[PDB]
Amino acid sequence: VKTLLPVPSFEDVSIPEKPKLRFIERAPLVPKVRREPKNLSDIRGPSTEATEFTEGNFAILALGGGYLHWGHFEMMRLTINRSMDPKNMFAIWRVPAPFKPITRKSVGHRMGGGKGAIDHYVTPVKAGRLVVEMGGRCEFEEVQGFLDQVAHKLPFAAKAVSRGTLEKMRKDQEERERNNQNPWTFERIATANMLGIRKVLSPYDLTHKGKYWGKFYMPKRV
């Protein structure tokens, strides 16, 4: 007598009118003229926006910083819209369209002579941000297949998550910090400037606490 179990019901779930992912344009509506500095600190450190679920239940979590160009959005859109069931699924963008202009100098030219011309636009992404959010009448195993396929093609370390796996991920990190048997931690040493260690550290290391190096995120660091 193999024991059967109840099944969750999604009858209470609603599907929007346009479940598929909308089209993202190469450049913004009005082209920008003022050229901008490189400002690499927009992909450095933890994300402080779009870190929580809003409407759906499933998403792709960014485990590192990077820039999404239009080529990346097309890969995400087509791959997801093709692999999803419009009747029982829906997806939304958790990142804005490319807005940061990237200049390039014409090939073959020497250093100097001013700044290059705007070539393309990108969307900066920080570690810990949700890139795409999905939901509807579906389990995690259904979407996780093609969501991980998309996450693997992103320019940064990414991974498909759910409301549960994300929560467990965060509680597992807190558990490691509490039961850590090492009496020495990066935070304690850095904040107290022990050994004069702040002479080889960055001012941001006071907040990143050794979990971040450039655009890379190290989840095994406590």
Binding site: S106, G108, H109, R110, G112, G113, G114
Partner: peptide, 18 residues
């Protein structure tokens, strides 16, 4: 050796007022 461009931003060379 391709001929390059020039910067179109002039001025902006004032010293600090102290």
């Amino acid at each position: 050796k391709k001929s390059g461009g020039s910067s179109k931003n002039l001025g902006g060379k004032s010293s600090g007022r102290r």
